[PDB]
Amino acid sequence: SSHHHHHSMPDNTIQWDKDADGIVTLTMDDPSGSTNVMNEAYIESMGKAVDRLVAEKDSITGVVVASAKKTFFAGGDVKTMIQARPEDAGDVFNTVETIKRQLRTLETLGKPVVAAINGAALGGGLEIALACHHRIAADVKGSQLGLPEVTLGLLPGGGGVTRTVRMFGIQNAFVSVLAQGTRFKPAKAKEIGLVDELVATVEELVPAAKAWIKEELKANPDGAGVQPWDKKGYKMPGGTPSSPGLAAILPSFPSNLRKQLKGAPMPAPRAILAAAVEGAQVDFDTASRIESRYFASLVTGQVAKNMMQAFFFDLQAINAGGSRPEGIGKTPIKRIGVLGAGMMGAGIAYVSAKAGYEVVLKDVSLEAAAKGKGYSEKLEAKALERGRTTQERSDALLARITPTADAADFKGVDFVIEAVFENQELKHKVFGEIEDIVEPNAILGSNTSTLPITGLATGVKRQEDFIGIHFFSPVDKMPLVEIIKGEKTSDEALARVFDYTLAIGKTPIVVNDSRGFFTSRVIGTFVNEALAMLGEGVEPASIEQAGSQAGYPAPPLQLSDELNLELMHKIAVATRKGVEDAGGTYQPHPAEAVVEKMIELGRSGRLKGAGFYEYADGKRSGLWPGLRETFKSGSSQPPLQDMIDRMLFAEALETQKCLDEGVLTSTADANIGSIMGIGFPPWTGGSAQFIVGYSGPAGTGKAAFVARARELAAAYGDRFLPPESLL
Amino acid sequence: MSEEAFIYEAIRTPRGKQKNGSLHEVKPLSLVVGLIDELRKRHPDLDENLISDVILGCVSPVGDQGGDIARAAVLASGMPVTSGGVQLNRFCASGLEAVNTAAQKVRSGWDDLVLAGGVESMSRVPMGSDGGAMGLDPATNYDVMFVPQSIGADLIATIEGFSREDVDAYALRSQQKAAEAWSGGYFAKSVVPVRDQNGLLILDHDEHMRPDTTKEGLAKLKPALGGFDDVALQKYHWVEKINHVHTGGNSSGIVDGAALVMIGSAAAGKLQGLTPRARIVATATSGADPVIMLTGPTPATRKVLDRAGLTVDDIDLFELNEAFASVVLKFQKDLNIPDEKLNVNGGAIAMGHPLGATGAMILGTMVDELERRNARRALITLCIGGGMGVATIIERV
Amino acid sequence: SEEAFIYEAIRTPRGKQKNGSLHEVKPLSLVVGLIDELRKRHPDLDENLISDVILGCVSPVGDQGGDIARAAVLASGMPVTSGGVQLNRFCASGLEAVNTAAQKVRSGWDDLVLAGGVESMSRVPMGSDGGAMGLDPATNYDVMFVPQSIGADLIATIEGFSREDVDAYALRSQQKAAEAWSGGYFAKSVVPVRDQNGLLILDHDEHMRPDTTKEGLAKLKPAGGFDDVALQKYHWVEKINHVHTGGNSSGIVDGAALVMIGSAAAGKLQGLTPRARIVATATSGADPVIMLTGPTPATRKVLDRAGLTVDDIDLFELNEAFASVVLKFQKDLNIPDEKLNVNGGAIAMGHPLGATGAMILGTMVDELERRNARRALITLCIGGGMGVATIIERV
Ligand SMILES: O=[N+]([O-])c1ccc(S(=O)(=O)O)cc1
Ligand SMILES: O=[N+]([O-])c1ccc(S(=O)(=O)O)cc1
């Protein structure tokens, strides 16, 4: 009933102003930061303002909600939400019920309420705007509008689910706005219905809002301040679950979502769909209360804590010079030179020119370098028809990519990114033929998968400017850039590649030099557990199903063909040689027997035409039918959860080893690096968070991770034994 | 144990087709009343006060079929107001479950004479018109891993290795044995033609039958969004691809129909001068996985044979509803059922599957075929959604 | 041969129709919550021995369609062999499910069966299923369909039950229900409803108005041609005295109930204590225009079937659909006033159609044990003119 939490004290965030017409202007200006956010201060501040709008309603004709910041209103207090324990469900429920009670009063005041959206209105901010009767957005660079709480394992618990279903129906609200937390530019926001009007600048917002209140009261006095769903003849778009047109396809919505998530344990889209459908069956207030319960179900959960730790806290520290050297200034980059025009080098030239840099794309012949720039043309021709870029913009993009085969065309290059074959001699030869033509103060980067950077750095004169800049195919999609630090690599170079990573719109992690680095080494334990399971006799279909239901983007056998089993065998030949001649004994992984068995059958992967799958006419066909007879598949039928856990634990344990060996310097880089680089499932929050935030039938936390690891060690092998650092 | 339950009459209507059907203009309440009036015509001197209940299976108790359609049948037919009337819904075996409950009511000794059967006018009340406790609950639908009946049958055929030609062979076989049964006059005394309020004929035959079916005709048919494949394979992770072999010609037909069975004790029949036509030996209920949805009959048939103290060799006639050809083929292969004892007079692929009434229709079919062959025992069973099963064993008197 | 025993009998609180606490709760959730409670009371129960789950539901559409009994089996995680069947005998659906379960136990072809009902009337109002006496004017015109409310008024008119007479019974039920709650009678059987987070939703029958006065009951106003249709059949009465209001009629509420019924062998095999024995069941009825009448021949039948008379029964429990129905039942069989609906009835707590027969069944199971008494008789009136009755004996 009350608009307040309690039923010394928080600060105040809302300014009050009542003009001579009777229009109140609520300006949100939280003094504890540059962005209005949903916290104790706002809840108590809006509580007072809503109480005052009721007490003085005789002398009030309309309300205008505005912001004094760059942004309108952005999100909530993650520092407080990430601490909600299962025993805090009552307080979480009462909070969002209080937050929505204020908006419900503001919404049913009998007077028009207009949102003066200046900057970004994301999450809790858009939920305030949706409580208004009319929304005006200033079309300005940077402004965004959306409800992205699903990307943190939450749901729009401030009426976002209940109101968007009221505005667009169950299907459109779930697909477009809710289930993926889509952010919208103000132009697209007006196109879909989240925003009603647009203005040129922010100075016109408040005056255009009062002009709308004036016309609305004069032209539509009966329905002024009444939302469409608060009218007698309201009909939900697309129908309600009782209407037969929707009840025919509604039972298919959960199964379609189960297909989208590939059976992964992510609870937020499931809860959003339930709250939406259950809400459409009842009145607005009962629907809003159901929305609160599903919100308290997610905030007190473990997956939401993993996502909030990874995509909020961990990502903020990385993007704020967390791993970047401190006392290093900037050094802008003029022209880029890319050695090699494969799907890697041609993709590096695309993202470098998509950011605005001039690129020189060298290969062996002009015939191949022109096919390297042809990788950027196809990604531009597709962007023209879909409508993301313009014609004058796509022409200026490809014009920065000058393909060549002449080593002399690298004159005037201050950033070198090599992407040729993984051969230490070839890289020594390639960098030796280029180090004297480029600038003296250039960056010499090497897109390397496994070869140590210290060894590669011997074949150049200035070893300070030699560094590993590991990209991921396809470069136009993968957002991580693994930056490797050789022994002779200088801190000054770390920053220049760090800043280059942010310039192309990518996320950096700093890694110390060692074979496998962090991404390739950890993803090796992922494919090795699946190949071992295949040799042990597990069904190939069950293996891929376990990899998809675990949360990975690509199943492991499918990924092995993309990685090419010729490269996998070579890595074992080198790793076996670096221990035998070093005066030791090599314990070969059981997956190596499966690797060589496929090589012997002439099935090295997708590059050579046939691997674990078959590949007719480019696209991938089904599994190779002879795979079952080759490995006696079916004789081993372990639990699916054991297959899933063996893949998750192999990477989680190997990640802890990298943190032990000093390969990674922070848990934040371990999480984002695992998620964005090798595709570790987002619901885990990273292969390091997977340990401390583990949950299963055994228990919760690091203690339960160890217990489940020892359970796998008893039945599968020693490699699932936790290191001392976790004991 | 206590009292023994006997079948005294078991009739049904012709099954009118869905598209341009002859029974589409007939309210389902009238289909039941018509069978009630036929029982009166066969026994004019019966004291209807002894009838203590009317139990009708109905999977979609909505619209023309809502409001306890069994009670409306008691009142509309002018039956004694003390004769009760109750609708039940166990999906596909609602018809047989009604007969089973009627027999179990007589066995308990607290009911003498009971009418039982089912009704389903699928051309007027389509499947799913009742909504669904799970259909509108996405939180439950998500967790229970729900897969429709058709995709389970495609999966059953994929696992057990039944090709498109294999299931189309059984479909042709059912179309033949049904046409042979109609020509031989096997159904003439139990299929009661539907007539209007003026006595004019509306339908006298199962008009869904396609008696001129050929192996080539079934091969030309096509298999019937959603994502239920990705859901089914998430549970059966060892299966790569589902082979969609089922079409509109190898699956049961959408039809309208009704069925009525009169069940009572031996004292009830002797008191009313009724000749027992068969005896209910045993019933049972079991099932298997809910995603495959259709492997329910297998443990239900074993549990009813184990209860009656019989084996597969002791059963003269097997009657399994032809919801999908792969389900019958699996049931045949698993129990090693002789092909000369299984659905000998055709099944739902030829004549139709009026959900709530199918159980009582195929029960009355075996009561007649046992007398015509002068055989001893018959076993009737049906698959059900969620992985349910209901089996019944009868013995000719 | 086999005897049927009641091992557990629980129910949810009954949430009212207007601004009710259970309006946001799916009727499927109500049944699952009762299943989770039976598991808590017997965690080492082998659920594979449960062969069927029989639920009564008068309006099986929307949230209550698609065989809600089967959904309670799958959603709760019970074995897929546990059956699941929904039935509908109007107001007796709850008691019919219990009786049918007991009859399936006696036949020997069922070992352990759950039985009960569910009716979320605030989400699925009665009549949502349609019916063959509204969409078919030909049969409606012939059977002389008259609602239950008018038959109750007609019963009071014929029997001489004044407006003060029926309101006196309404006050009597409100008092006896408040006394039973405060006395802790319902503490063990009424299972409070909670959400997905364990937060409390409802823990009491909120339709109760325990501060009711006879002065306030007389302030109430009573509840299409049905008056003339009824008198066409009952031509000896000139006018129908409308005496029933929302204060002396049953309450429209949400709720569910569950009963565990099985054989003595199944009870021993699973370590369950039998709380009562189902002696006999019976069905009958009377005229379909006055409708409600029907319990009286159904009660005489179950008494004659068990070789018992009125003087052999310790407690009588008849559903308080309308006040005149209970007063007519009490007048006919000459029920002592202190034996009838001793812990209150539907007038105070509610009548969730599909589950009511199973709620009053469990209410008598508790009161027999609380008083250390022998027998009790449970019955309900039904639309269309039916009626079912059950006699239980304490063990
Ligand atoms: O952002 N929040 O969800 C939030 C909830 C509760 C509180 S408070 O109860 O500590 O005032 C503050 C912020
Ligand atoms: O609404 N909320 O997200 C919320 C989070 C945490 C807390 S608590 O930890 O202060 O109990 C209260 C409310």
Ligand SMILES: O=[N+]([O-])c1ccc(S(=O)(=O)O)cc1
């Ligand atoms: O700016 N952001 O990246 C952002 C992410 C999530 C949220 S929310 O989940 O708290 O609504 C708000 C803002």
Ligand SMILES: O=[N+]([O-])c1ccc(S(=O)(=O)O)cc1
């Ligand atoms: O893809 N792989 O199978 C793979 C195996 C081992 C290594 S490692 O020796 O560098 O750790 C890297 C990659």
